[PDB]
């Protein structure tokens, strides 16, 4: 088995701006990678195409995933509304890592965040489950639309996901 690379096509304001991939570490966590991976085909029925980056800091992070509230109070699983802490054998090591977002031990739904900077105060605490592949000059450009609070200064959705082969 090959990791699964998924792809999200940015925009800003609806406007393209390109395409960022991801490898997804399934050969290390399986069932972390696989929600993300099903939520980026939409084959459960729910997922990430049209939702936004709800929350950008810039020297940070880029954070989305809540396809229900749509600012970081939703989301759901592929397995429930919650699921556990899979392991934290990957390690926050950089711009470009993938991470799940939490509120507490064992939350894990559907957001998550690209990193921008090396977030080492969160290894343990939040399981890391891929890297971004091609497009981290996507993941730069978008950080330009965040702030210091988060908020973004333009709508940046991800127009279109899915998997590549
Ligand atoms: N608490 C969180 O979900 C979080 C999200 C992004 C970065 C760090 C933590």
Same mark, same amino acid.
């Given at each position: ?8 096509? /940015? ?9 960022? &991939? ?28 049209? &939702? ?61 965040? /690209? ?22 000059? /996507? ?7 965040? &702030?210091?609070?988060?908020?973004? &200064?333009?709508?940046?959705? /991800? ?7």
């Amino acid at each position: 088995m090959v990791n699964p690379t998924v792809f999200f096509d /940015i925009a800003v304001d609806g406007e393209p701006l390109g395409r960022v &991939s991801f490898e997804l570490f399934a050969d290390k966590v399986p069932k972390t990678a696989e929600n993300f991976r099903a939520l980026s085909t939409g084959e459960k029925g729910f997922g990430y195409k049209g &939702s936004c980056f709800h929350r950008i800091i810039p020297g940070f992070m880029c954070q989305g995933g809540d396809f229900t509230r749509h600012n970081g109070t939703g989301g759901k699983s592929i397995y429930g509304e919650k699921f556990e802490d899979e392991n934290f054998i990957l390690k926050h090591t950089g711009p470009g890592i993938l991470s799940m977002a939490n509120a507490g031990p064992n939350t894990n739904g559907s957001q998550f965040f /690209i990193c921008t900077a090396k977030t080492e105060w969160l290894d343990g605490k939040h399981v890391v489950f891929g890297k971004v592949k091609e497009g981290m000059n /996507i993941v730069e450009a978008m950080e330009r639309f965040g &702030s210091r609070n988060g908020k973004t &200064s333009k709508k940046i959705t /991800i127009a279109d996901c899915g998997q590549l082969e």
